[PDB]
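Task: complex structure prediction.
Instruction: return structure tokens for all chains below.
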Amino acid sequence: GPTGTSESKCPLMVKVLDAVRGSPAINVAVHVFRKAADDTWEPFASGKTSESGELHGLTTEEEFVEGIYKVEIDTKSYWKALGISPFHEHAEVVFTANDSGPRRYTIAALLSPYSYSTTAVVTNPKE
Amino acid sequence: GPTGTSESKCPLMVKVLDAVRGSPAINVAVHVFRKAADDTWEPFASGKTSESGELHGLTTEEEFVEGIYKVEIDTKSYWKALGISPFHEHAEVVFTANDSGPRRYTIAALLSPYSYSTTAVVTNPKE
Amino acid sequence: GPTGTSESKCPLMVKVLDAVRGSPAINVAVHVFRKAADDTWEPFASGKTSESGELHGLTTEEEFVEGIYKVEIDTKSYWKALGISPFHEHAEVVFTANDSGPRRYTIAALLSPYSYSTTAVVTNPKE
Amino acid sequence: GPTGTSESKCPLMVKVLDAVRGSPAINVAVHVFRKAADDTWEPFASGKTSESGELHGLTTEEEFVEGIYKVEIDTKSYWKALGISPFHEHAEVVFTANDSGPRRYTIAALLSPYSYSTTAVVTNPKE
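Output:
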């Protein structure tokens, strides 16, 4: 299914939903980046959301170390495919991953042509 | 300002936005009810949003007593008028008003066919 | 786990998340009602969200017929437990369930003390 | 009105709300960038939100040419100032502006520690 840099103990997952049709956003391209010491965004993982609008196996726990990560969702292409003119070029989610805090990260995005919401669910279990 | 009927100091205001068109939601019918002593909803005020997606002059400070109120937004008619089949029948906002002194309420609503967000901004008046 | 009127082929499910803590809202009371011909809301199913903030087995496909349903989420108690003063008395979701349209219904709610968003995901599979 | 610098007809405006307190988010730092010909972000304008959670006078109609712009909202500093540890580093809003004639843009933002919604309201000016 939807997987990126090695399907592992999904410590990071992306969920995308379409608020116009009331369905998950399928085949949306998602690019994850990590902030390098040179302070640039270097590629990390990427993929297309699945039938259920999810993206799993982006990374691994061993490779998912503390740092600033940027999740970029290609919303514009998504709306253009539907023949709908959007407002944003894409949607970004910038956050610092820490070790002390809970483990698994679920980033959710709800999309409309002129608006988008984003939530983080941080828990201890698999989700 | 006004007394016993319209926007005394507009203690109650409603603002609605369209997340599909990136515009204010115009001509949206709004009905306000107050919880009646006999535990039933009594019609309190009604109106439609203007060109700016706003609704003012619903009530007055003297008429806006303590109580539980219900702001009902006819979202369904709105999308239907636009050629879209929405999911909700309407959006309802229920809250206790003025129970520790009068305040000014702005009920904001962001609409999408299958989704809606509502937020309240509360102010302690000053003059 | 979290189940209401007979755990069946979950044609209706409730998902509730807390936007202040970045976690699912656990132990939230949810009451579903159906509009009766007398046009009153008669009880249908109810329960408390689980560890993951979900509520399943509310109803059955045979008993989940077309009609107007109201999902009521006790948000106020939820915030009061956390020692946080909320704005709404509760959150309601009013919608018409139809047969032609897709099958399974997932109602999602994202909560903040002064704001709440709600989405419907309507699909053909189990979710 | 103004030319070459501030709110000519306020072609660009930003409004931020706090979903935890039910109030405007005051003193939130905002940085605007424009995509530079060499594919990099060039500082375009900056400011802080007022008592009303608003930011006006960022640019002028003559200076607000066609281009891709990035509105960055320092949400992190905001919650930290409030004693809360947020999830996002900030909230970024990227869009193409004025590519088919000048328009007026109102970028709205609703904030919660672990969640944020952003909406745009676009107007074709008239005088």
